[PDB]
């Protein structure tokens, strides 16, 4: 687990120990466990004397380990100007690539070594060489905020609009990393300000995504399009409002960016600031032009988007300005419906304080109380029933909130609806009562609550079917015994005369019979 003695001598620049070792063992290219020769160590630490000794004793100046890191690569990465010179005079190859296709110029430019980069360029290094991801040395210089390296590479006729495999120009990289000085040099040297990435992202889009305000001002000063869209229709205000960067949003709106723009999903910048919860960005959007009641796909408002995530103070902000809670989607869902689905009690309370109508019904026929009863939201149902909610509201199908609480097996909603007015004697379109559903689904505890509040076990459907008929047909012996102790008639027949024993015979449950 210790290094070979020649590596240790190379690290310490000990030429006497190295000379003794090479007199004993004449191999200067002894390999460590990682496969690095002592020349690699000498190039890393810029130990000139031991490097000259090793090269005079026959060390491979162009040694290539499995990862392809030559000593010239290490000297260029570390900034060892004198070692780079010495290796170049002894025959170091200038175009050799690593496993990720990095040249020594890539290593020099990534770490911003201007002198080394100029030395390699003067020896014929390829300035347009690419890595596995298509990064030229100017990309690596722009990524590291190496202003003078970018300047030197541009002076050596590097392509200012070279793209990576992701179609990223050096301006794109400068905008992504927030290096406004590199971006300034590139744009003053003629870089295109509206270059498109793979997803149609301009450098302005990336600057507005990462809250890089100085890059944004520098781009807009040099003729970047403020209304440029991506493939999805994203404006820089859509990106800034979604990410919540208030300085970017304020600067874009001050300069005259349109705030009522839409994308494929017909979403607006206020929609993305409601769906993300940035109340201050949305507040500034509404001070300027913004349609608070604007509609997207599926007829969704920013109130719909704010109610889904449950961010309460945005709901209060949107509602206080001009938002109308009674607006509904294509499926008929008002923001009260969405808030009741996710159990957002504070959002429901804020919506209800601003005249949200619980009488609004979806296409299926569901009030917000229905949705709470379907999804088991007992805090929302408690708050709705507290303030003007009809427990026996029904649509065309006749389903009440008690129907959908029993159907989805929400005991807490059932135990909350019954004392407040949820009637057990409410028939559906087919005449089914809430006790009909419990008896079929073997909800014994729900049935006990339904029976305790006056549920009738002999209530009949449109075809004469009682809950005892459904319990016996489904083979629920405990349900049948419960109903039979609450005045259920076991001899009662349906329209065709079928008794519960007939329905037991059809399916074959011995314990029920």
């Amino acid at each position: 687990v210790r290094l070979p003695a020649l590596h240790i001598a190379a690290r310490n620049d000990d030429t006497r120990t190295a000379a003794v070792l090479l007199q004993n063992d004449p191999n200067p290219d002894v390999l460590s466990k990682t496969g690095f020769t002592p020349l690699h160590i000498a190039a890393h630490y810029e130990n000139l004397n031991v490097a000259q000794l090793l090269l005079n004793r026959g060390a491979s100046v162009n040694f290539t380990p499995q990862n392809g890191i030559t000593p010239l690569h290490i000297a260029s990465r570390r900034g060892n100007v004198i070692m780079v010179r010495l290796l170049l005079d002894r025959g170091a190859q200038i175009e050799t690539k690593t496993k990720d296709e990095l040249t020594p110029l890539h290593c020099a430019a990534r770490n911003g070594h201007v002198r080394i980069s100029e030395i390699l360029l003067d020896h014929g290094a390829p300035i347009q060489a690419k890595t596995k991801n298509g990064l030229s040395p100017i990309h690596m210089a722009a990524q590291g905020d190496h202003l003078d390296c970018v300047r030197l590479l541009l002076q050596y006729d590097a392509e200012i609009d070279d793209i990576t495999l992701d179609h990223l120009t050096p301006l794109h990289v400068a905008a992504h990393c927030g290096h406004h000085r590199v971006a300034k040099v590139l744009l003053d040297k003629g870089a295109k300000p509206n270059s498109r990435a793979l997803n149609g992202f301009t450098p302005l889009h990336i600057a507005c995504k990462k809250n890089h305000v100085r890059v944004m001002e520098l781009l807009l000063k040099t003729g970047a399009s403020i209304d440029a869209v991506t493939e999805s229709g994203l404006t820089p205000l859509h990106v800034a409002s979604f990410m919540g960067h208030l300085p970017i949003v304020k600067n874009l709106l001050q300069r005259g960016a349109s705030p009522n723009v839409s994308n494929v999903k017909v979403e607006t910048p206020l929609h993305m600031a409601a769906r993300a919860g940035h109340t201050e960005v949305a507040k500034y959007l509404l001070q300027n032009k913004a349609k608070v009641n604007a509609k997207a796909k599926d007829d969704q408002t920013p109130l719909h988007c704010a109610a889904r995530i449950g961010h309460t103070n945005m709901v209060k902000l949107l509602l206080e300005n001009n938002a109308n809670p009674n607006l509904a989607t294509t499926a008929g869902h008002t923001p009260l419906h969405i808030a009741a689905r996710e159990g957002h009690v504070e959002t429901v309370l804020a919506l209800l304080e601003k005249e949200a109508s619980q009488a609004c019904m979806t296409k299926k026929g569901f009030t917000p109380l229905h949705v709470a009863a379907k999804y088991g939201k007992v805090r929302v149902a408690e708050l709705l029933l507290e303030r003007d909610a009809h427990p026996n509201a029904a649509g065309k199908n006749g389903l009440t909130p008690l129907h959908v609480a029993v159907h989805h097996n929400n005991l807490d909603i059932v135990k909350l609806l019954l004392p407040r007015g949820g009637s057990p004697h409410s028939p559906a379109w087919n005449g089914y009562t809430p006790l009909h559903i419990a008896a079929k689904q073997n909800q014994v505890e729900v049935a006990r609550s339904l029976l305790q509040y006056g549920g009738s076990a002999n209530a009949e459907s449109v075809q004469g079917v009682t809950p005892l008929h459904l319990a016996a047909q489904e083979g629920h012996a405990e349900m049948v015994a419960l109903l039979l102790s609450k005045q259920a008639n076991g001899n009662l027949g349906n329209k065709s005369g079928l008794t519960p024993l007939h329905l037991v015979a059809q399916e074959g449950h011995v314990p029920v019979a």
Binding site: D145, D148, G178
Partner: protein, 323 residues
């Protein structure tokens, strides 16, 4: 490490401590951090005496932190050693931590000012003021433009130019105003080694708030071009030609040129060249013998009645004679 004297005693502050806002490591981290992270608040001084807050453009501090490059006469930017990129997550973290430590211890109008980075000496340049009305009604806006000479340390030198415009902005309309910044309009010549503070101030009706922007403009002097071979032999005569183009509005009089440089010229040699009329060129040749082997540098200084201490340099590698 950064040497930071305190009016006294001196402190050694690591650059990383300033970058990370490690206030408490050394006593001077707070001052160095405030040197490159403070915010600028602009107040308008009304003639009534009341001090009104102004809606001003962001004045960034700690810009282009520069030092001489290694192995070259190029300029290296080391701002990333002192600061995270503006608006980044790391800068946000550092700023919030510094704010937390200090707290524990203790509009319808938009103005955009476009200015060139330099104004030629006794020369001409154009500036642009963009005003954007966001109100639904038209605005009677008083736009005030000022030019002031400021020293390197921010001390006000002299008031050079003021300009008052009266514009009407249509509702939801952007207006671009181009103003020519001419040296001959200045009430007095700027003092030497000073910079130009260009300010714009837009006030409308009785909104009690004024848009404000400012830009620092450097004064650009004629380029001193030095022509000299890249390599020179030791103990052999070497000729360096120096050229200057008179791009001013007056002749260059009382003209003195000096040449120096350690390893090429013993002390300095000053010469007189003829007066240069406008749009003409000086072209002076100097012969000297380099006597020290190595990478040397020739420094040329030109003096006249229009400008003084105009200095340019050129590097020459002096090589040993062939054996």
């Amino acid at each position: 490490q950064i040497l930071h004297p305190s009016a006294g005693s001196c402190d050694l502050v690591p650059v990383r401590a300033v970058k990370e806002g490690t206030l408490g490591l050394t006593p001077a981290v707070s001052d160095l951090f405030a040197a490159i992270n403070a915010s600028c608040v602009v107040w308008k001084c009304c003639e009534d005496g009341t001090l009104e807050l102004t809606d001003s453009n962001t004045k960034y501090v700690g810009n282009n932190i520069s030092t001489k490059g290694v192995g070259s006469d190029r300029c290296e930017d080391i701002t990333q050693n002192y600061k995270y990129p503006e608006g980044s997550l790391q800068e946000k973290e550092v700023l919030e931590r510094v704010e937390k430590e200090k707290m524990e211890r203790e509009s319808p109008l938009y103005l955009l000012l476009k200015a060139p980075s330099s104004l030629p000496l006794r020369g001409d340049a154009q500036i642009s003021v963009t005003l954007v009305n966001h109100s639904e009604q038209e605005k009677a806006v008083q736009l005030a433009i000022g030019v002031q000479a400021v020293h390197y340390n921010g001390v006000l030198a002299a008031k050079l130019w003021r300009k008052k415009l009266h514009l009407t902005l249509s509702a939801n309309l952007e207006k671009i105003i181009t103003i020519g910044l001419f040296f001959s309009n200045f009430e007095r010549n700027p003092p030497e080694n000073t910079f130009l503070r260009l300010t714009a101030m837009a006030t409308h009706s009785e909104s009690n708030l004024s848009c404000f922007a400012q830009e620092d403009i450097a004064i650009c002097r004629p380029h001193l071009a030095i022509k000299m071979p890249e390599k020179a032999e030791q103990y052999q005569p070497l000729t360096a030609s120096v050229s200057l183009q008179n791009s001013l509005d007056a002749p260059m009089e009382d003209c003195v040129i000096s040449i120096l440089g350690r390893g090429l010229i013993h002390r300095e040699r000053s010469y007189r060249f003829r007066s240069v009329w406008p749009e003409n060129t000086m072209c002076a040749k100097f012969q000297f013998t380099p006597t020290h082997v190595g990478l040397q540098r020739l420094t040329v200084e030109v003096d006249c009645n229009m400008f003084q201490n105009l200095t340019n340099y050129k590097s020459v590698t002096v090589v040993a004679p062939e054996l």
